[PDB]
Amino acid sequence: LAMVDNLQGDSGRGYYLEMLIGTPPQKLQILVDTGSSNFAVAGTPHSYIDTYFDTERSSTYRSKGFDVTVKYTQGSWTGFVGEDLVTIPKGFNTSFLVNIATIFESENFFLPGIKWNGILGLAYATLAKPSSSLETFFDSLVTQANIPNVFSMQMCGAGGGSLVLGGIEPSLYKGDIWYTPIKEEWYYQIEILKLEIGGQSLNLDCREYNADKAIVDSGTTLLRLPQKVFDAVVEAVARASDGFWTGSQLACWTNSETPWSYFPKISIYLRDENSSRSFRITILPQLYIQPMMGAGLNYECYRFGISPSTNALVIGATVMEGFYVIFDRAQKRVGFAASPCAEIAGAAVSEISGPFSTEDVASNCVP
């Protein structure tokens, strides 16, 4: 009841945290990314951001004497690597010394109409660039503030949010929290056992879901699926009810065409900590058939909120905005809970239940 609504933004342009860096403090707006591990901010002006961190104005900034480049599929960013005091105004009294990379050169990184000008990687050390020895922001914070090594997040973007650093806040969920084990400490890698479309299982060996990893990533907008899985998912979804599937086109329907009521639930089964058991998280059409214009007319146009990936099943925003998600690094596990702020009009857009037996599935679904 301190870090409750400390996020801004939405399930399409990201959820960002307010952060004060350096001395005197400069105020930045930093995207919460659970699928990377660097703290990086714009260090120079750039045409698509309002402000940046000018390291020359901070009396406490020190440079490490080297920079870093990070590449992703469509772009990259290069930054000087340094160190400075940071505070999170909504959440913390004191300031803590962390590493920061200051971006002076990027491509496709700051994009038109984005509201943030930095990125907070909350994943594990193994993914920090240029090596795992670049102390991550959350390892600093945990060590220096004496908090438990747990954070948790609630997105209210469906139809802002909360990032709780060092625990769990009861008012952000309802019902029970279910925990699935972290299979590997890099991304937040978890073990998917079964995908069900409108209550029918896909015909797929459970290893298809975890080739080559299933991860939870607040830094990815769509539920992203390996091609083979995404081919099953499209076929199954389109059965139960072409540019649309690929995200090339939007489908427009009037509101009495009631398009949400003619698409199936999608369920994802995850192993309990008790390995002989699983629970399921479920999204409804509301979360994966997304209204694009919000123009308040008598018709909406929608994009399919699932996309193919090459090397990963990415449980991105579009599943996460259904639940309160606990990243409990201490006990090696990821919690899911129904999220009260996940309701449209007052209608639930997501479901959690369990347990179910794991007799039916292998004892390890990760190749």
Epitope: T60, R62, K64, E83, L85, V98, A125, S133, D139, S140
Partner: nanobody, 112 residues
Framework: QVQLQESGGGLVQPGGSLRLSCAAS????????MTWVRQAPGKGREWVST????????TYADSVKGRFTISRDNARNTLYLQMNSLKPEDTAVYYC?????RGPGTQVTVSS
């Protein structure tokens, strides 16, 4: 591969002095933020002090302020903790830390 080893721990009287050292091997120590944390039997870890890579930025837990001095000697890949005016409540295991990884620790004991 963060590899660390603490020493200089030992048994001292209240009012006394100890200098802890932490030797690093196999990581970029001269580029690393470095921290000291402590844990008494069955209580939670307590942060002690953090130092930035060149030594110029140092921070301290209220509980140790003006009594402990954190410092480093990069050319020797060694972290230090000068500890003056020790009291029974500083009794704990001390560990140096970086990027998630810690050494085995060193035992400091302050008794009558």
């Amino acid at each position: 591969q963060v590899q660390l080893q603490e020493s200089g721990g030992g048994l001292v009287q209240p009012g006394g002095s100890l200098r802890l050292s932490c030797a690093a091997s196999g990581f970029t120590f001269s580029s690393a933020i470095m921290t000291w944390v402590r844990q008494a039997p069955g209580k939670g870890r307590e942060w002690v002090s953090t130092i930035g890579s060149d030594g110029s930025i140092t921070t301290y837990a209220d509980s140790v302020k003006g009594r402990f001095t954190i410092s480093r000697d990069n050319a020797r890949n060694t972290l230090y903790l000068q500890m003056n005016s020790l009291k029974p409540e500083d009794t704990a295991v001390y560990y140096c830390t970086s990027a998630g990884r810690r050494g085995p620790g060193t035992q400091v004991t302050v008794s009558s």
